[PDB]
Amino acid sequence: ITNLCPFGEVFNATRFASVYAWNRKRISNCVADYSVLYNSASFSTFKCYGVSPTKLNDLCFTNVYADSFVIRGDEVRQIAPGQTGKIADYNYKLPDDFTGCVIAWNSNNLDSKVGGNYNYLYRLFRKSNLKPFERDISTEIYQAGSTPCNGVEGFNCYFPLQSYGFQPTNGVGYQPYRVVVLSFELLHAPATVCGP
Amino acid sequence: EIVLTQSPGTLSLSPGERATLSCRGSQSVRSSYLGWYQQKPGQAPRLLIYGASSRATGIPDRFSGSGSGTDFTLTISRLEPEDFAVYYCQQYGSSPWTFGQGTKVEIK
Amino acid sequence: QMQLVQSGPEVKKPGTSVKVSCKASGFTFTSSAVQWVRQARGQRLEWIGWIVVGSGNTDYAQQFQERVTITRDMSTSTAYMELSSLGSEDTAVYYCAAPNCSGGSCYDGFDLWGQGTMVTVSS
C-alpha cells in the first residue's frame, strides 16, 4: 500500500514556473513511484545520471527536489554538470558530480500556444555564472558597464529576462521541452523517500 | 528625436594650440551614457570617450571629455596631426539615440 | 583587435529586401549588444537599429517603422539586419557596432566597429 506524494501531479500542470523561477518542491516521507517515469513512460530524453534509471526505487535519497522548467529543445542538453549555454550558467545550474535525474519531454501541446508565451522567460546577462541550485528570482536591470543606471533601461542596463519566442509550429529543437530536474540529495540526514 | 547642435563644423584646429569640440544636449542628459567616436575619412569610426570617464583608447590622453549635462567638451591640450576626422557625440541613454549633425574637425 | 566583418557591397532593386550580415569574433558575442547605423556619402550617420543578442530586444529609429528588422544568430555569432521596402535614397554603408568586451559583466563603450557594408539601390 504505502502512499504516493504528488510527484506525478507537480510533473503535469498547466503552468511550470520559468527557467529562473523554477520551482523548489521538497518531498519527504513518500514512496515516490518512479516506475511510472522509467518502467513505462513516454517521456523522451530520460537521461538520469548519478544512479542508473533501472532499480531506482531500490535507492533511497534524503530529499527529492523536483524541479520545473520550460526550455527550448536545443538547450535541453545544457541541463548537465556545467556544460555550457545560457542554461546552467546564467540559470539553474547542476553541481559537478551531481546526483539526480533529468526528465525532458517535448511539450508542443499542454500550454504552449501561438506567440511567445508571456511566462517561460529566459534569465541571462547576470553579473556572474551563478552557483548550483541557487534560485534566481530577483530581477534587476543588469549592469553591463561601470555607471549604475538608476532603474530604467537603455543601452547596457539590460533587462535580464527574455521571453521564449516559440509557436506551436516551430522546428524540432525549438519546441519547449518541459524538463524536470529531480535533484536527489544524499547527505548526512535520514533517508525518507524509500519503497517500491 | 534628440538634436545635438555642436560647435560649428569645419572648425580650424592645429597642433600647438588647445582644441575643443562640444555638442549640447537638447535636454540635460545623463553624462555617462554619451560618447564621441570619430570616423576617419573613408573608414569605420572608433570609440574615444564617454561621459569624460575613460581616456581615448588607442589615442594619447591629450583627448579627454569634459562638461556636465548638455554641454560636453573634448579638450585636446595639444592637438595632433593624425586627427583629421569627423567626430560626433553618441547618445545611448534614453531609447532614441541621435547620431548625425556633422561635428567635423580638421587638422591644419 | 576584435574582428567585426560584414558582407561585401550589395546592389538591390529599390523597394526590395536586403540582408546585411555582421559577424563578430574574438570576443563573447552573446553578452554584447549590436548597433546599426547608416552612413551615406557626405551626411553624418544615424540609426538603422540596435539589438541585444541575449535579451531578445530590438529597436530602430522612428523613421524606420515596420521597414527594418534586425535578427540575431548565436549559432554563427552574427547579427543580421533586413531593410524592407528600402527607399531609393537608402544608398549608404550600413555599419554594425558593439562593445569589445568579455565576461558576464563586461565593458560599457562601443569599442569595436564593423568595417561597413556598402548598400546600393540601383536600377
From TrEMBL, chain A:
Location of the protein in the cell: Host cell membrane; Host endoplasmic reticulum-Golgi intermediate compartment membrane; Virion membrane
Domain BetaCoV S1-CTD: 3-196
Domain of life: Viruses
The name this protein goes by in its record: Surface glycoprotein
Organism: Severe acute respiratory syndrome coronavirus 2 (2019-nCoV)
Organism placement in taxonomy: Viruses, Riboviria, Orthornavirae, Pisuviricota, Pisoniviricetes
Gene name linked to the record: S
Complete-protein stretch covered: 291 to 486 of 1232
